[PDB]
# Entry
Amino acid sequence: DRPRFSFSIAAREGKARTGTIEMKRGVIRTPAFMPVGTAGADIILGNTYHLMLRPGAERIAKLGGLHSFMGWDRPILTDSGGYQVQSEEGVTFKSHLDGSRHMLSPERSIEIQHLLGSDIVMAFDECTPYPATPSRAASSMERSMRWAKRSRDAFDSRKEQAENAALFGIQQGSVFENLRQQSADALAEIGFDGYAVGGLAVGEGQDEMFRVLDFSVPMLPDDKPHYLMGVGKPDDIVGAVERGIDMFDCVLPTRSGRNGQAFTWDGPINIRNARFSEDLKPLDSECHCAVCQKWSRAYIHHLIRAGEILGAMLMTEHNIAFYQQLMQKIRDSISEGRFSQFAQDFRARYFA
Amino acid sequence: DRPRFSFSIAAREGKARTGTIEMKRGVIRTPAFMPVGTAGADIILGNTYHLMLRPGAERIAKLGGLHSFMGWDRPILTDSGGYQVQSEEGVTFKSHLDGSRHMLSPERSIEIQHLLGSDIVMAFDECTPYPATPSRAASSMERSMRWAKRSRDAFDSRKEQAENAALFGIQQGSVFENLRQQSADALAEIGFDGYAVGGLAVGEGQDEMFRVLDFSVPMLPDDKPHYLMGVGKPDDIVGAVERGIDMFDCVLPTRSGRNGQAFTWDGPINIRNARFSEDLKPLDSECHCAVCQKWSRAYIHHLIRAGEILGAMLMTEHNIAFYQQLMQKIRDSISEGRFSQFAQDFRARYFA
Ligand SMILES: CNc1nc2c(CC[C@H]3O[C@H](OC)[C@H](OC)[C@@H](OC)[C@@H]3OC)c3nc(N)[nH]c(=O)c3cc2[nH]1
Ligand SMILES: CNc1nc2c(CC[C@H]3O[C@H](OC)[C@H](OC)[C@@H](OC)[C@@H]3OC)c3nc(N)[nH]c(=O)c3cc2[nH]1
Ligand SMILES: [Zn+2]
Ligand SMILES: [Zn+2]
# Structure
């Protein structure tokens, strides 16, 4: 029987790591990409904010929880709901769907995630806007740390959750090294199963994001998983792994799949462009996915230009699969001691 | 090696028949439902009118024909293009996509279908509008019969087509028995591999459609397949099989699948309705399809209400599968001598 939560590092190269998270419902290979569940992956995401509004967390619990609802028996991660949605108590807001009132606090966020039944629960934080002044970044981060302690206590009070799920704390501090250090220290003093780097992928751009990761990731406990929230494009993932990140989520593969953009080893392509109308190659020449085994760029182009749902489905399947092939190549290259070369080769081709 | 075309009737009950069409690319079990190819089925449809406009028949031929383009190596049926789109020569029209000029005549329709590479080719006809006066129905049907002879001659002139594909003639005559008889006689004198009943499912309603089928289907050669174009809802299919029809096509399973409607043995349901929000049963209680094996009405409701493409995909998979299960039950019941009872039981439950 697997443990509630156990992270093991099997191999390292520079700051990059590869290993496994063992949980009751399954093993998660890291570095991991975690796709949206409503889109192979070891863990999927539930969309807390959306589920709060439709059908509501209590209704999901009545239907048996998200694993039963979605037909997925392996681990599920949920966000805490606030990024998606003010006072020291929490945040209040009205639903556009039916005008109903909703409050969100650390305690209510943890209870919502309990009712959804997720395996990895995020602490309730404030994703500081970018740019932020030092003073506003500090007061925001300080509130998030008080909220992290409240999240910890709420999670620990619910026996089923404490014994079967895991809780991640979220580092804030904007782009400021001293605030990132204070946030890391506060989270480690509380104690979490994993640590997310929050407050990035909010408009700062890759150079600044990587600069912040350079000093921020080493501040977190080395022996616990590191989750970069909201990232990202394939090259963002590669560079973040080089800086010690173990877990990723991003709306891009599905959003791109519905808007005509396919990820390939030679960079993204917009399949609706006329240059693909007679292209008999698969979406990607090396991709092992079922779409690239059977259908051409020309046919996918045709389906999407015709408005056929099949086209969007095939694009999404391809993009999700590409992301998982990327993560597999990352894991194998770290394990084999050739991740530095992989990253260099990946970039040369992706940006050529 | 299978023949170019061979229809065999294995069993009969009343006017209903079950059997097989053997063609070079596969066997088609009848009665058959023929789904749109861009949506198990033995034959799929190509959309001639759409393909003429995007990317064009010549471009499809350059890409290897529809079988290669769509990744489907079994039989394909194409329409002749005119219903979808005037003089004795044919019809002229301008494309809304790019303003280009397109002519359509019996000869050009057959050439388009040749370039697409379809296995069952429809003669180029005029689908008479409904209602029609006797005089207008007669002059329309007479033109269609002249066009049927031109279609036959064009098909026979193209060696690859004549030796490897099949040609169906289309009966017209609106709702008038004498014109339906004249049309049947003219088509049989020309000679076709199969015979379609055209000019129905154009607003006349089920009672009138069945009345016309009652006298029209017996006029066609008994030993050849009978295709009712544009039909239809499940109860239309059952009643048409009772009247001697062997083949069907209809936009409903896919159109309904994209608009929230699911077919079930207890009738159609609109899965977006709030009454399904907590319904843990599968879409249909008896359906063997993968969707009903894994997911609930409540989850499909949620996906479609959320705008997720996955929901539309699952609804479409379910509807296509339901149609093929219906056809399998029809074939088995005729073969077993219990189709009369099946039709009675089907209607009692579908309309309860
Ligand atoms: C884009 N840059 C981006 N996204 C950040 C999310 C949201 C993650 C959430 O982002 C979407 O929701 C809105 C996703 O829905 C499509 C969720 O997956 C279902 C995902 O939950 C893990 C952050 N969440 C928290 N709690 N705190 C953060 O500091 C943070 C930073 C992010 N940067
Ligand atoms: C609804 N009532 C309906 N549809 C009739 C179609 C069109 C069939 C065609 O109907 C859609 O195109 C428009 C389908 O596209 C969704 C085509 O499948 C791809 C399908 O081709 C077999 C008829 N076609 C011809 N040539 N002649 C007819 O008399 C006729 C009668 C129909 N009644
Ligand atoms: Zn692929
Ligand atoms: Zn089903």
In short: The pocket of 726 (ligand 1) is lined by residues A 36, 45, 47, 79-80, 82-84, 122, 125, 127, 170, 198-199, 201-202, 229-230, 249, 251 (CB under 6 Å). The radius of gyration of chain A is 20 Å. DSSP finds 14 helices and 15 strands in chain A.
